[PDB]
Structure formats: structure tokens, C-alpha cells
Amino acid sequence: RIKDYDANFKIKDFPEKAKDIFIEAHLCLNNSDHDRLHTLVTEHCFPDMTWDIKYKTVRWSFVESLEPSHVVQVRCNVYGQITVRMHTRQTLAIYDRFGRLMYGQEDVPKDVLEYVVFEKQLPYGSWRMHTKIVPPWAPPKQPILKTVMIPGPQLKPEEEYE
């Protein structure tokens, strides 16, 4: 279906383009380039990437890809979604409004395995990141620097704790 709609697509050549799109989108997140983000990721992706990062600086950098990226699953007014498994190595450093580090290390690289789902709209559409599937068996993410308090039930006077 993808080939009958486009006539110049290559599944074998897709992974390099997908990796380039991913790197460019994350660099756009780093530089707060929403205009380029809207071209590199879908409208279902952009809010997920930007909402919680608003008012904070992210220092993201891709250092290397451990194993070559390769397509995994592809399905299809008509959209086509391609799942690409990438096991690469990246860096993070997220700071507060005040420039205080709150996640990751600016230099230490970390190995990340992820499944990026790209989508395309079938005249002027293109391939843009649509989602990231997180395996239920995914290793726990890096712990946060600051401690957290989770309030218990804010009991009303009549209510009693259980």
C-alpha cells in the first residue's frame, strides 16, 4: 500500500531516514525549535514532547548508535505507520527555570532501547515521529535528583483513616 501510494519508498533505506528524523527532532527540542518540530514530529507527538519541557532547558545529545536501526512493523485520509526499533546511546541534562540540574548528567552517556512509531499522511505529507512504544518490561528510568512527598488521603473531619 505504501509503495502504491508513493512509488519511490524503500523499507531497507527507511531506518537511516528515521534515525535522522529522530536526532533532528530531539535537537529541535534542545534548541526550542517548534517550527522544525512541527515538521519532524506529528501533532500527536509534539505536545507529548513539549508540554512538560516548557519553561525548562534540555541538553540532549546523541553520541552513538549501538546496533543499526531497522524497521520492525508497518501498518496502514489514509495513514501509514512504521515501527523502528532503535537501541542507541544518548545523554540528558534537564534544568529548572533557574538552571538547576534536575535529571541526568550532561556528559555521561546512557543506553536507550526504544520503539519509535513514525506516521505519514497519504500529497505534501512526510514521515514524522508519531509515538514511542515503551515495553512493559522496560528497565526503570533514571531516578530523579530531588526527593518527593506523596500526600495521603486528605481526610475530612467525619472521615477516618483506613
Residues that bind another protein (CB under 8 A): 55-57, 59, 93, 95-102, 143-153, 157-158, 160-161
Q: Which is nearer to another protein, 93 or 112 (CB)?
A: 93
- Which of 74, 112 has the CB closer to another protein? 112
Q: Are strands 101-103 and 70-75 parallel, antiparallel or unpaired?
A: unpaired
For residue 93, the minimal CB distance to another protein (Å) is 7
User: Is residue 112 a contact partner of residue 87, using CB atoms and an 8 Å limit?
Assistant: yes
Task: Judge contact between 85 and 135, C-beta under 8 A.
Answer: no
CB of 145 to another protein, least distance (A): 6
Q: How far is the CB of 142 from another protein (least distance, A)?
A: 9
Residue closer to another protein (CB basis): 6 or 96: 96
User: Is residue 19 helix, strand or coil?
Assistant: helix
- Name 116's Cβ contacts closer than 8 Å, sequence gap at least 6: 18, 22, 83, 84, 86, 129, 131, 132
Q: Nearest distance from residue 103's CB to another protein, in Å?
A: 10
The residue (of 101 and 133) whose beta carbon lies closer to another protein is: 101
Contact 46, 38 (CB under 8 A): yes
Closest CA to 46 of 56, 57, 36: 36
Q: How far is the CB of 37 from another protein (least distance, A)?
A: 18
User: What per-residue string of b and e applies to 80-91 under the rule 16 or more CB within 10 Å gives b?
Assistant: bebbbbbebebb
Residue closer to another protein, measured from CB, 11 or 155: 155
